Amino acid sequence: LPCRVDGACDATIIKMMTDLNKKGIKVASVGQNYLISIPASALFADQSPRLNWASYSLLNEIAAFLKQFRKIAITVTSYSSKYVSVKRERALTLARSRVVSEYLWSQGVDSRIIFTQGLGSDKPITSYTLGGDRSPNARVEITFRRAV
Amino acid sequence: FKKPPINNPSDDATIKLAEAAVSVSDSMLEMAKVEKVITPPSKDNTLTIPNAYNLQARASVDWSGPIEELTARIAKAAHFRFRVLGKSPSVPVLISISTKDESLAEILRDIDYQAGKKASIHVYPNSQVVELRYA
Amino acid sequence: AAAAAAAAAAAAAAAAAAAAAAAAAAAAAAAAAAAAAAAAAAAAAAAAAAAAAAAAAAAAAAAAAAAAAA
Amino acid sequence: ALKETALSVGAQAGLAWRAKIIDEQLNKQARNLDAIYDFNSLVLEHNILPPVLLEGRNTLNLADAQSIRISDRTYKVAKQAHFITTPPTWRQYLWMDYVKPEAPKEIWCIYTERGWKNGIDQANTILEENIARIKEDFGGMILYRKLLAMNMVSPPYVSHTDLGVTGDGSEIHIDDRVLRITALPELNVNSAEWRAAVAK
Amino acid sequence: ALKETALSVGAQAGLAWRAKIIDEQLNKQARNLDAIYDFNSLVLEHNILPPVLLEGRNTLNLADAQSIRISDRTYKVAKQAHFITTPPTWRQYLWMDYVKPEAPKEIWCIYTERGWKNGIDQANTILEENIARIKEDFGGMILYRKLLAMNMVSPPYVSHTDLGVTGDGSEIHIDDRVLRITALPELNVNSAEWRAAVAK
Amino acid sequence: IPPSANDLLLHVLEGVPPPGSRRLVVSGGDARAWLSNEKMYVRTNLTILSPGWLASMTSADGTHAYEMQKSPVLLVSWHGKVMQLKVEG
Amino acid sequence: IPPSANDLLLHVLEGVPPPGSRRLVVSGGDARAWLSNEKMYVRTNLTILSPGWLASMTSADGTHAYEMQKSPVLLVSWHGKVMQLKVEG
Amino acid sequence: IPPSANDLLLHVLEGVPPPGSRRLVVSGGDARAWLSNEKMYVRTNLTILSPGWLASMTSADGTHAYEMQKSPVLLVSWHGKVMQLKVEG
């Protein structure tokens, strides 16, 4: 027989979506464009392209949330606040996003492409520029479009 | 805590199958490297973008058929004169463009390209004329 | 089915079912993009079972003998 | 076997019920479908129904191992232009047929539900082909008006042989005009006078 | 005899179970097998499937008591080059067939286990020949690309007879290219223009 | 001289079946298939990959129409995903 | 003039059986044997010693393919060890 | 040379049926229909739209008379309203 559910349920989608918004990973849901926005405090160490060991659990319900949708291209892009220069900053955020997409295709996505890139605070979501990775500007964002 | 990958070759046969997959896919690649004929961009023979403001207007065409009629029409859509040099063969040079939104100098790029060597396009933008040359 | 978002509002053809919050994960029609990757048929991926035979073996329509189903 | 005839009871009842639901669902959108499938202002100058042209781009045929034929576009004249009196509506093409079937345990109930959805989606495939047929026929007439602009077809050439008062003394017809189609609309192969759809 | 039909019950169930296990064991390695058996980028310039060449080195035939023939290498063209539309996958060559058999004391139990391993290794020999057939066919195409480099075969010589607008007025095809293979890929015996695989 | 295509691919480039056909139900993908005379014809916009087709057309909107022999499974690409479609008949 | 070899030794130099064969199970060694028409064909990389073969080929990797009459035991050398292989059929 | 009309449309432009007919009852509109020989004839003053007629006349007062094939439903315009008429026979 053909399958009713594709290894996913809508109750589990909104259960992970409430749990990610309770742990502060903000899931925006516009049309079929999905955005999960992750502060860089909640994954890495400060001004580093290196994961903390506990933050792979945060990546676990990120990846188990990304199980649930039929998707074609995830793009993951990272940007933080200014530390030395924009050149050092863009090298940091490129390594940052490529490390988290290396873990995300180590884990389960059914995406066909993950595009991955980093920017040098070129798109900052607040004008308040407190510090390093504790800034809410300092974030990675994982955006995709849910196919059909 | 992190996990191993899900489809990971964590198995003594599947590592051998997947190292064979790595070796066959890159051996396909230096294959494709040695038989890939290219053209260098110094010597590509095709048209460029002739960057005139009438040729950067904003057009749309659905078509298959003979080439001199479209380039007559995109000359008088671009307010350009149309010259033909050469003689039209009994079989016509048959190209086809169906784009509903692209730039009309890049039509003339697509025209020259799908003509290939049966004909080619020249644009003189100071004289405001396109010209279609046969062989 | 479309559980706990709301009840299922519509059933969008060329798609999955449409819950009354968002698009569900339960397939509406037969012709949606359901991830079939394991078929279950005699002489699949050769041609189909040539149905006119009445013997021991099962012959495909590409004239192979389906020895895994005879 | 009783389970099989339970399914066969459920099938035609589901087909007729789905036929009913989409008939007044069609009739709810009746003026909208006259706007969509407006054949009335697609007819030609002498109330000639335009022919249905079919476009197939980018065509391959693998004839054998030795040879293929590709062609880039294919235009086919299907069901050629002809004198229509009153133009077609959508209701000849889309209306599914309503008869009310008056012909009537646990396995009966579950297979009459699976018969009921089998009748429902089989009526859906009948409706899908009905929409497909009207989209073929109407978009073929639209494809004419493209190629009549674009000079790939001829327009029909009518001939009106006017006749005066006509007949014997038991029967007269006063203004007796006989109208014929001489030249049918017809794709030209002399291809140098073609056009091309360049807009802005 | 009842022991024999116990073995025959166990055989087809073991075959179908082993067929199932290696079908999703194939599907677990689906992208890996598209990397291995990549026929798609082995096809020729006019989407021609390359032929399967067979190499046999160092060959003897004992014809009778009086005479042998040795040859050093033998190249055979098997299932000659031809116009393919879409290239072969591994799934026509490797996928074993899954049907679910719905047809059902102590001697029954021990011979249904020996029937079960007889069905298992007989499905293994079917899979072994399937891998053997794809290794024949794919490595024959690889052996072409060796000998096409190494000048022991001809490439296929296509001919594209271009035609313009084609047909009557009821049917036109606009750019009508007929593509044939005239010269098949074919081993040359005029052997002085051969090559030799010296590398560093 | 080969035949051009089949001209009935113009009909199955629209949704309409060929005259005198049998419907084939298609599971697991957006395609419609009919069987005219020991040949099936598939209206899809997916790309059929494995079993090979004899003729093809494509409309203005990227819908394709394929003439092929009767194979009970179709393999397509959807959006780079290898996908299976299953036909009964 | 003798025949060259059998050209079906090219097929059993690969693992593929000849068309229209019967499988023979081989015990006690890495070989595969098929019986086409009162002749068996053995794919091995061992060296058959006692019962004598009518034709032989060898691939690039030292796999050999032998045409021989049907004998129920094969004697090979494995690595200098005299070895026995047993075929049913 | 085509025929002119049918001259029996003069009779069904009046209310009188054709000789040797069968009456058809008409529901849902002011029309009368008779069936002479596998063709029905409709006296109306409505405008028949969908099923197409073969011949037509019109009297002095806008009454029309139509020759058409037997279709069990007639679609008319009444006063811009699309309307249905239903015939038994």
- Encode chain A in three state secondary structure: CCCCECCCCHHHHHHHHHHHHHCCCEEEEECCEEEEEEECCCCECCCCCCECCCHHHHHHHHHHHHCCCCECEEEEEEECCCCCCHHHHHHHHHHHHHHHHHHHHHCCCCCCEEEEEEECCCCCCCCCCCCCCCCCCCEEEEEEEECC
The tokens for D54 are 């079919």
Interface residues of chain C, partner chain A, Cβ below 8 Å: 1-5, 14-16, 19, 21-27, 30, 32-36
3-state secondary structure B36-91: CCCCCHHHCCCCCCCCCCCCCCEEEEEEEEEHHHHHHHHHHHCCCEEEEECCCCCC
Report the C-alpha gap between E22 and D58 in whole angstroms.
Answer: 40
Which helix (H) or strand (E) covers residue B126, if one does?
none
Q: What share of chain E is helix, strand, coil (3-state, %, to 5)?
A: 45, 25, 30
Report the C-alpha gap between C48 and E99 in whole angstroms.
Answer: 13
The tokens for G14 are 């690969």
In residues, how long is chain D? 200
Q: In chain C, whose CA is at the least distance from the CA of F69?
A: C47
Q: Which residues of B touch D194 (CB under 8 A)?
A: 65-66, 69
Q: Which residues of E touch C46 (CB under 8 A)?
A: 92
Report the C-alpha gap between H14 and C16 in whole angstroms.
Answer: 60
Instruction: Tell me whether F82 touches chain E (CB under 8 Å).
Output: yes
- Which residue numbers come right before each break in chain D (C to N over 2.5 Å)? 104
Name the residue among D146, D5, C35 with its Cα closest to residue A7: C35
What torsion do the CA atoms of B105, B111, B112, B117 make, to the nearest 10 degrees?
180
Hey, which chains touch D, using 3+ CB pairs under 8 Å? B, E, F, H
- Name every residue whose Cβ is closer than 8 Å to that of residue G58 and which is 6 or more positions away in sequence: E56, E57, E58, E59, G13, G64, G65
Instruction: Tell me whether D151 touches chain E (CB under 8 Å).
Output: no
Instruction: Tell me whether F53 touches chain E (CB under 8 Å).
Output: yes
Report the C-alpha gap between C4 and B30 in whole angstroms.
Answer: 53
The DSSP output letter for D153 is: B
CB contact under 8 A, H52 and D85: yes
The tokens for A44 are 């890495």
Neighbouring CB atoms inside 10 A of E77's CB total 17
Q: Which residues of E touch D62 (CB under 8 A)?
A: 83, 85
The tokens for A134 are 């504790």
CB A116 within 8 A of CB A84: no
Q: Please name the amino acid found at residue C46.
A: A
The tokens for C19 are 């819950």
Hey, which chains touch G, using 3+ CB pairs under 8 Å? E
Q: Please name the amino acid found at residue F18.
A: P
State the smallest CA–CA distance between residue F21 and chain E in angstroms. Answer: 23
CB contact under 8 A, B2 and A103: yes
What are the two backbone dihedrals, phi and then psi, of residue D93, each rounded to the nearest 5 degrees?
A: -100, -30
What are the two backbone dihedrals, phi and then psi, of residue F32, each rounded to the nearest 5 degrees?
A: -125, 140
DSSP, collapsed to helix, strand or coil, labels residue D69 as strand
What are the two backbone dihedrals, phi and then psi, of residue D96, each rounded to the nearest 5 degrees?
A: -85, 160
CB contact under 8 A, G16 and E129: yes
CB contact under 8 A, G6 and E68: no
Q: Please name the amino acid found at residue B73.
A: R
Selecting from B20, B32, B94 the residue whose C-beta is nearest the C-beta of E175 gives B94
Name the residue among E146, E92, E103 with its Cα closest to residue E15: E103
Report the C-alpha gap between D15 and G82 in whole angstroms.
Answer: 76
Instruction: Give the side-chain half-sphere CA count within 13 A for A61.
Output: 20
State the smallest CA–CA distance between residue E90 and chain F in angstroms. Answer: 9
User: From edge to edge, which strands make up the β-sheet containing H22-27?
Assistant: H47-48, H73-77, H82-88, H22-27, H31-35, H39-44, H64-69, H55-58
Instruction: Tell me whether C48 touches chain F (CB under 8 Å).
Output: yes
Residue carrying the six token digits 């695989």: E197
CB E112 within 8 A of CB E68: no
CB A111 within 8 A of CB A73: yes
The tokens for E191 are 């052997």
Chain CA centroid to CA D96, Å: 15
In residues, how long is chain H? 89
Report the C-alpha gap between D152 and B9 in whole angstroms.
Answer: 60
Burial label for H20, CB within 10 Å (0-12, 13-18, 19+), is exposed
State the smallest CA–CA distance between residue E161 and chain F in angstroms. Answer: 10
State the smallest CA–CA distance between residue D134 and chain F in angstroms. Answer: 9
The tokens for D38 are 């407006």
Selecting from H52, H54, H75 the residue whose C-beta is nearest the C-beta of D91 gives H75
Burial label for D83, CB within 10 Å (0-12, 13-18, 19+), is middle
Site from D59, D74, D147, D150 to mutate, F interface, most F CB atoms within 10 angstroms: D59
Q: Which residues of B touch A107 (CB under 8 A)?
A: 3, 5-6
CB contact under 8 A, E32 and B94: no
Computed on alpha carbons and rounded to an integer, the radius of gyration of chain B in Å comes to 24
CB G11 within 8 A of CB G18: yes
CB pairs under 8 A between B and D: 44
CB contact under 8 A, A53 and B6: no
The tokens for A104 are 């995300």
Q: Which residues of A touch F81 (CB under 8 A)?
A: 112
CB pairs under 8 A between D and H: 29
Report the C-alpha gap between H88 and B21 in whole angstroms.
Answer: 74
The tokens for F37 are 């005379």
Q: Please name the amino acid found at residue F35.
A: L
Crossing angle of helices E2-28 and E106-149, in 10° steps, is 40
Burial label for B78, CB within 10 Å (0-12, 13-18, 19+), is buried
Hey, which chains touch F, using 3+ CB pairs under 8 Å? A, C, D, E
The tokens for A55 are 């933050």
Selecting from B64, B74, B96 the residue whose C-beta is nearest the C-beta of D198 gives B74
Report the C-alpha gap between E104 and G9 in whole angstroms.
Answer: 42
Interface residues of chain C, partner chain E, Cβ below 8 Å: 37-46, 66-69
- Name every residue whose Cβ is closer than 8 Å to that of residue A1 and which is 6 or more positions away in sequence: none
Chain G and chain C touch, per 3+ beta carbon pairs within 8 A: no
CB F76 within 8 A of CB F48: yes
Q: Please name the amino acid found at residue E16.
A: A
In residues, how long is chain G? 89
The experimental method behind these coordinates is cryo-EM
The tokens for B14 are 């599947």
Instruction: Tell me whether B24 touches chain E (CB under 8 Å).
Output: yes
Residue carrying the six token digits 């004289």: B127
The DSSP output letter for D156 is: P
What torsion do the CA atoms of A103, A107, A109, A115 make, to the nearest 10 degrees?
10
The tokens for B27 are 């051996």
DSSP, collapsed to helix, strand or coil, labels residue G57 as strand
Q: In chain A, whose CA is at the least distance from the CA of B5?
A: A106
Burial label for D51, CB within 10 Å (0-12, 13-18, 19+), is buried
CB E7 within 8 A of CB E108: no
The DSSP output letter for E192 is: G
DSSP, collapsed to helix, strand or coil, labels residue H52 as coil
Q: Which residues of A touch C3 (CB under 8 A)?
A: 9-11
Hey, which chains touch E, using 3+ CB pairs under 8 Å? B, C, D, F, G
CB contact under 8 A, C67 and E126: yes
The tokens for H29 are 């509109």
The tokens for E16 are 């179908």
Q: Which residues of H touch D171 (CB under 8 A)?
A: 4, 7
CB contact under 8 A, F50 and E92: yes
Residue carrying the six token digits 């296990």: E21
Q: Please name the amino acid found at residue E164.
A: G
Report the C-alpha gap between A141 and B131 in whole angstroms.
Answer: 51
DSSP, collapsed to helix, strand or coil, labels residue G45 as coil
Report the C-alpha gap between H39 and H25 in whole angstroms.
Answer: 15
The DSSP output letter for E40 is: G
Report the C-alpha gap between F22 and C26 in whole angstroms.
Answer: 29
**Distance in angstroms between the alpha carbons of the first and the last residue of chain H:** 33
- Name every residue whose Cβ is closer than 8 Å to that of residue E136 and which is 6 or more positions away in sequence: E52, E54, G11, G14, G15, G16
Structure resolution in Å? 3.5
